[PDB]
């Protein structure tokens, strides 16, 4: 089945607040990115032959070029100011629970799971401790799972042969928390 | 502070469909319903903090419609392949028997941005208590999308997310069952 898609993305990149902004507009026709506008360059640049005509045409209109370069402030910085009031500071504390499983053959237990869900933003730290010593190896993770509704979830597992008397602790550090969250097992 | 605001828009033929939306660090801020000409916030609470004038987005789409025709003519026999999606199914949060939860059907890395998604419970289509997002942008040229199903956890039921896409031989079905 033949399909035709005119698709564009206008990406506003921020480094340390609106201290350094960079606008990057990308044009695609079906599966090919054919042209782009990098604010750090100041003008359109064809990515493939199919995008040359537009670079040639648009680049020769000083009035229009001036307008795009200004979007770094008229659009990027302008919108960041708005979003900095509710999206940048969004914080949702995670729900942390620990529980054992098998995974392998059976008898006893070999996997300790630290489940961290329903949190935001995405940067988070999950550590495992065995009687006070941080377990660096034997860690298996599902990775940062994005739910699509502005919340994340993840599992961080420790592979172990539990010896009665040993206390395991899952420690979670996250921006929404004033103090590390810990759960023992 | 590292952040990224992506504004994405497109027009697709022959389906004759357009889209205009904003993304913040990977999550949808809002999109414009083209037909109804209105702003739809991904999270209700967002509306009290900002606003958008939809007609501006509709104008942009009109320009994309026009440009697509130029692009078709400019490439001549530009038609090509497509990318089948990866599909995954997982629960929103920890599942506990009897406690209502939500199944998430994650459709990733595909194009064109068109799909047929069906939720199945014990092999039957479910159309109540379901929802979805529009076509979301990725770092590359492909799209991603989320479908949701509300459900009552049970040890004897099973679920499936059925996804059909032009890049697939036959419709794809990903399975999900509860486990304690």
């Amino acid at each position: 089945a033949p399909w035709f898609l005119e698709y564009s993305k206008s990406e506003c990149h921020f480094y340390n607040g609106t201290q350094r902004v960079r606008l990057l507009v990308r044009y695609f026709y079906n599966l090919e990115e054919n042209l782009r506008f990098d604010s750090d360059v100041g003008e359109f640049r064809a990515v493939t032959e199919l995008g040359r005509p537009d670079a040639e045409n648009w680049n020769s209109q000083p009035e229009f070029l001036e307008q795009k370069r200004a979007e770094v402030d008229t659009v990027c910085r302008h919108n960041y100011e708005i979003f900095d009031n509710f999206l940048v500071p969004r914080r949702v504390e995670p729900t942390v629970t620990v529980y054992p499983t098998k995974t392998q053959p059976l008898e006893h237990h070999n996997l300790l799971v630290c489940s961290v869900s329903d949190f935001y933003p995405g940067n988070i730290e999950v550590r495992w401790f065995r009687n006070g010593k941080e377990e660096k190896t034997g860690i298996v993770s599902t990775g940062l799972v994005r739910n699509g509704d502005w919340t994340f979830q993840t599992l961080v597992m420790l592979e172990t042969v539990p010896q009665s008397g040993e206390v395991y602790t899952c420690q979670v550090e996250h921006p929404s928390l004033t103090d590390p969250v810990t759960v023992e097992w | 502070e590292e952040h990224t605001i992506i504004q994405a828009e497109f027009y697709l033929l022959p389906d004759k469909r357009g889209e205009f939306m904003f993304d913040f660090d990977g999550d949808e801020i809002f999109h414009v319903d083209i037909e109804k000409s209105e702003t739809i916030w991904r999270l209700e609470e967002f509306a009290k903090f900002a606003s958008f004038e939809a007609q501006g987005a509709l104008a942009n789409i009109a320009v994309d419609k026009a440009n697509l025709d130029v692009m078709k003519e400019r490439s001549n026999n530009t038609p090509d392949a497509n990318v089948a999606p990866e599909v995954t199914v997982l629960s929103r949060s920890p599942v506990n028997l009897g406690e209502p939860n939500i199944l998430i059907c994650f459709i990733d890395k595909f194009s064109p941005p068109v799909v047929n998604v069906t939720w199945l419970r014990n092999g039957r289509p479910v159309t109540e208590g379901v929802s979805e997002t529009v076509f979301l942008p990725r770092d590359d040229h492909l799209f991603r999308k989320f479908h949701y199903l509300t459900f009552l956890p049970s040890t004897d039921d099973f679920y499936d997310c059925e996804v059909d896409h032009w890049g697939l031989e036959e419709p794809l079905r990903k399975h999900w069952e509860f486990e304690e």
Binding site: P53, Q67, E71 | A50, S51, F52, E53, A57, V63
Partner: peptide, 13 residues
Amino acid sequence: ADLIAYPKAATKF
């Protein structure tokens, strides 16, 4: 509720 700006779309030939 401040107004979100959007980049303007350009026309091709």
